[model samples]
Target chain A: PKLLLVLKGDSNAYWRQVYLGAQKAADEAGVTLLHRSTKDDGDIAGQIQILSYHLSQAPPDALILAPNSAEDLTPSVAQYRARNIPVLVVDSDLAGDAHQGLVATDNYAAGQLAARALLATLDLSKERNIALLRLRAGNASTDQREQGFLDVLRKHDKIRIIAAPYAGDDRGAARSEMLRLLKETPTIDGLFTPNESTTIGALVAIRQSGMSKQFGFIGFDQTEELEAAMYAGEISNLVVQNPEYMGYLAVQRALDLVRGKPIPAFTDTGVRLLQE
Target chain B: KLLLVLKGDSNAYWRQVYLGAQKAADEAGVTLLHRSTKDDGDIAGQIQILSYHLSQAPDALILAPNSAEDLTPSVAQYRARNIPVLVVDSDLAGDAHQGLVATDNYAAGQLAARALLATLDLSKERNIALLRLRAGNASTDQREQGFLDVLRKHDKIRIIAAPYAGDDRGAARSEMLRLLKETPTIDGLFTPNESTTIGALVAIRQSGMSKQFGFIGFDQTEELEAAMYAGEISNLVVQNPEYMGYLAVQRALDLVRGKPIPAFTDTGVRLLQE
Candidate 1:
């Protein structure tokens, strides 16, 4: 059976690792894997174009897509489902259950893990102001992660969740928002970064703002730079999702679906806290 | 006008520092020119690059120096030009620079030692070895000093040997293997930097001494984390490099604008132990 793997963005190392894992799984499954990457970063139209192009290619037996926009990709995913192709959304999901299976990490659980890690590092009884470095206003994965983090913190009355600002996955934007937050808030004890890029951007902002020691930092994902900072004792902890496993498992599940095997509707890869 | 010179590229961490600088620049309406060294190792090349840029005569320079000793002369030259200089990330030997914004390197080393002590039965006297970058840079040196200072606090720990590995993991592995052979009684080991720790992990595994010795590394890396989970590395003293970069830029802007900035800003440090 032939498989189609569509990746959302090409800029991040996380996406690249996911692609590699999917490719490895596809090879192991003995299925032809056609990979398509969106040229424009976070371009929903470009993702749709790539999806449409892959759908026309003899109608793949299974499709694994990491959508740019959950709402915009729902209709495209539904179109594939209408053509009787099994679809598995990886990394992120669409608005509705247009796909047969969702193979991704439990971002909400990861967020909870982040909150727990933060609580471990900080004293909740001490009135602490924390900022959430949000990727966008309504990104599902980010929203879930942010919600999970907020929900965990909500139980603690001393922890104040400062209004999150949209970073747009740009380092400059995140820094600006962080600076504004720093200026507005007298004391910021911790910052939660829901996305990998945003975490990186937040780290820079935290460093430049000279708040490295002042505010505790907990971010999502693991980057080489973050690891260095972790060693340097800058960031307290990182909620790391296995992106490689997420990609590999998504493809494996998609292959299973193509072979007439029943796949779980949603499979959570899991998350770990990388403590510094 | 505060002039901040970034000595790195748009890689994940540096990108954040650049953004912070950009935001500060925009808010203050000050001109900030950030030049990337691109190569972290090209010490002489970085100095030459800075010298050429200094020809433009910027008000102040914020530097994340690539090398501790090699960049001193060039930095001194800038000082001679009456340009205020703020050193970020790593420190220089001469106290010619105006201000320094960095994480507590010595404290980070001590934290790694404390983490190691937590994992081991510290009642018995143990032989501890140190692995570090051969760069003779202030950061690595301070890390070593911090580790030794903490070890000295505990009379039960004996310093067996100190080795250098040219700041490369492969070299670090070779040196660690050699040290293990020469000093078979080594009970614990500490790496002053990330590369050395990773290389030492591989060396420990290959030497079949993973379970025997207490291993502590400075910095967090995927390889190190995996090793730590597998029980090869006892602990990790993690540094916030991103924070160092960010704070350096902020302090640089403050110093350049003649605003009151702290002379030495010590960022926080943490110890990771499983």
Candidate 2:
């Protein structure tokens, strides 16, 4: 089986887990799998370039992609479909109906879960400004999560959202951007970072801001430090995903399709909140 | 045998540390094993690697921790076995490590203000934008705070736009560009790390605002060094990276030999000018 998995991240542990799961499936199936990804999560353009480059060469038998943007790679997916090549969407999806199946966490629900956890943990009696650190704009999963968070947040009276200035997919900038955000705003009651890098970045920013007072931090996805921070009282809540199960399902579905087993439209790996 | 652990950073910055550690390792004819973390944010991963390296029971352990406080327990375990721990670049919590070798980032920031002041008349008001590397970073935070501490005392110069560049040079360039977007004519610019320094340098040059304002930065590279000599940058608060590593390892070696160890070593920072 000429299978390939494309990821969206720059050294993100979440994606690494997903890749490992995919590798496990490939090994069990007795197949060699090729994987590719951009160095940064927000590099939609770079991912597209990679997809196009692969298409130019001998197209892999099956491609499992975690698209960077909703619309950037639709045409290419459509092109792959035109050639009768099977494409599977994992983690995130493209806009058009050009992929066979989606195996990912319910990011929208994850966002609402993050909001609910933060709301329950913090003092709702007093009005507060809950900051949202979106990990770039194009990734459909994060976009859904941001909207889901805002949708739930629309009900709260005291909690206004202070959106950060820039959209980036890595940890370094998110914390740095949060610093700029903290300086501009008078107060930030809590923060919710919607992905791995942004979550770590938000943690670092909140920690450095001298605002780590049960200041109520909620982050999507897990990292070693994120869990450690939660244990240490630096983070209030974390939203984690079962990428192993997700990646396994993604490849399993791709294999099912390969064997004409009639692949399902969507497979939910799962997401849950962890609190200390 | 010595196990040298570190996190990824500037090619020049960490390379200097390696050079210093390697040179000392060669002098003593000890086999040096150097390892670095790929992701700075993944402290959990570091623990696995860190724990395994310590289990090696090497003669000495040199570490530049990703988190200041998280690795304190590990440092203690090494000390329990009498495996001397030298914390470099960043510090661990408590007086756990035998010796610490790193720049006085806060003091460096103070020096940066002085260098920027050298370029100014001081009677007039100016807005200075500081581009920091990341939040919760032990090294850059001190430099940024120190810079703000000194600059805030001067009522005329309003300290504005302390933006973080994250840990990427490209991000630093982009943030500098964004800062330029808001306030086109920045009177001064300060970058706290190598990435920020290079990013701000490119952004300032891209906007063609090189000569208009006073620019001060921390850390050094061949490119940054060249920029300083070319008159593109005002001055640099340079850390002696090579020296810092040398001091950290040298002290660690002292402990291995049953010699007395210093509680702390001021590896020191110096200002470089044209």
lDDT of 1 by residue, A1-276 (tens): 888888877656678888888888888877788888875446677889888887885678888988877787888998998988999888776788778888777888888888888887887555566777677533568778987997898546556554455566555666776776677554578888887777887788778877775667887888799888877878888888888888889988988888789989889888888764
**Each model's C-alpha lDDT?**
0.75, 0.78
TM of chain B, each: 0.83, 0.92
TM-score of each: 0.49, 0.51
Clashing pairs for model 2 are A172-B166
- As a TM-score, model 1 comes out at 0.49
Per-residue lDDT of candidate 2, residues B13-119 (tens digit): 88889899889888878888887776554566666777897665588888887677677787888888877888888756666677667775556776787788778
lDDT, candidate 2, residue A274?
75
Residue B233 CA error for candidate 1 (Å)?
Answer: 63
True contacts kept of each: 0.00, 0.00
